[PDB]
């Protein structure tokens, strides 16, 4: 039979679209981490830096804002490689279970 092969390849392609939304969602954020860390180093940092996002301002200094900037940029580029490997490993797993079932 050849139907278990041609339909299992359709199953791996649909997980490539399931891979597609999650990695690019993080990938748009690392370029925002790119543009922020460069403007902070060029501007004066002697006055105190805060962290403003939607709904909260915690009164901070420059020494507490700065390391999380370099941290959250590095965490994103690891996961977008990690989310690629896991979903592509899932496409390999469903193909062999379809071949051992309907034989």
């Amino acid at each position: 039979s050849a139907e278990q092969v041609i339909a299992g390849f359709n199953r791996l392609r649909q997980e490539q679209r399931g891979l597609a939304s999650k990695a690019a969602e993080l990938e748009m954020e690392l370029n925002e981490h790119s543009l922020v860390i460069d403007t902070l180093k060029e501007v004066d940092e002697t006055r105190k830096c805060y962290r403003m996002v939607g709904g909260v301002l915690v009164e901070r200094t420059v020494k507490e804002v700065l390391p999380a900037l370099e941290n959250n940029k590095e965490q994103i580029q690891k996961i977008i490689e990690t989310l690629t490997q896991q979903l592509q490993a899932k496409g390999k797993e469903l193909n062999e279970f379809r071949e051992k079932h309907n034989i």
Partner: protein, 107 residues
């Protein structure tokens, strides 16, 4: 006839799909309200702390803001119980009724 009792449990399936997605929000809102409480319980340097719902950020001391932010995680903690009990209830309503549908149509 028998067509009408088919559509009732099918309409019950989409209510479960609404019930499944409400618990994903309320689990996130508890932990995120817990996460912002940790970052303000992290600092000891400054009692200055701004809270707000819109783009306004009022000046208050941080200690009264903690106990309010203790209540923010707690109401979201309260709702995950009543939803999951509801989500299981709508799950038990459709699935046990689905046992009635297929086995007696195929009979």
């Amino acid at each position: 006839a028998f067509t009408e009792l088919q559509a009732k449990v099918i309409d019950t399936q989409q209510k479960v799909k609404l019930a499944d997605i409400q618990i994903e929000q309320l689990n996130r809102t508890k932990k995120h309200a817990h996460l912002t409480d940790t970052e303000i319980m992290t600092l000891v340097d400054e009692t200055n702390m701004y809270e707000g719902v819109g783009r306004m950020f009022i000046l208050q001391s941080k200690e009264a803001i903690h106990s309010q932010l203790l209540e923010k995680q707690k109401i979201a903690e309260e709702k995950i119980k009543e939803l999951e009990q509801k989500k299981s209830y709508l799950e038990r309503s459709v699935k046990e009724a689905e046992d009635n549908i297929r086995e007696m149509l195929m009979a």
